[PDB]
Amino acid sequence: PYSSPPTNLRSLRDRLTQVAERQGVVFGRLQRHVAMIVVAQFAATLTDDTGAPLLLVKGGSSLELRRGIPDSRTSKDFDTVARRDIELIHEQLADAGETGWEGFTAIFTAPEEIDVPGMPVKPRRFTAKLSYRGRAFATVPIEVSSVEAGNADQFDTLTSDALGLVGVPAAVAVPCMTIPWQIAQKLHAVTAVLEEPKVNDRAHDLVDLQLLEGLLLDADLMPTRSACIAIFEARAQHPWPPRVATLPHWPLIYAGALEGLDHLELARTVDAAAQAVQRFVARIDRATK
Structure with a gap:
């Protein structure tokens, strides 16, 4: 592996180009997965006062974490369920993104309502715009639904080693809605x-x-x-x-x-x-x- 983290955006991309070649993956797929995992790390910093997750990953991103890249469907959205109002979730994501993680920062666009029936409080969509050491890296679409019944009473935790492959050692551990x-x-x-x-x-x-x-x-x-x-x-x-x-x-x-x-x-x-x-x-x- 690499012995230090990427010095800048160009290095990050170069290392991704190398990892995609080795893994037999398309550069875009790998870059997307890494971007999702960075957003997931921000999501995982959102906790209540007992340390429990406020935001659980679901949908395709969850399946990609459970099964690995080769044995999961390719998906572009980062879908989540939240235990708090959208304004709070968005604000805390924004705070975490400004603080940063391992050189990555993020800003988050305005949550926009999605017309879904059967939900008293409808889901919201927005985008994370990620940067690495100050330079624009990737955008990730995010969707946040409110809790329904017991779907956030428990969670599984899934880990990825993808950031480790490009020289960023911090563990990735993501809380996910259960199967x-x-x-x-x-x-x-x-x-x-x-x-x-x-x-x-x-x-x-x-x-x-x-x-x-x-x-x-x-x-x-x-x-x-x-x-x-x-x-x-x-x-x-x-x-x-x-x-x-x-x-x-x-x-x-x-x-x-x-x-x-x-x-x-x-x-x-x-x-x-x-x-x-x-x-x-x-x-x-x-x-x-």
């Missing part, structure tokens, strides 16, 4: 019926649900049913248990979501994916108390 709640959210999202202008485009959730099924401990099947019930009932949209339908443009959208996952036992067509996820729904639904 039962990720399954509940993704099952709800992929089976939702969207309003006339919008069309449900979320075939990638079928990939994520199969990956989550692979990671889920058999002993957490009851907690998964409990979470699914909680989310479906809280949102009060379509009822549990859902039917995993697919839309006319999903065959190719689904295929696109399989990019880079050739070494995994996944359904290779959207129809087989829908069948697998429906089988999972049935298995969850049987896990009663």
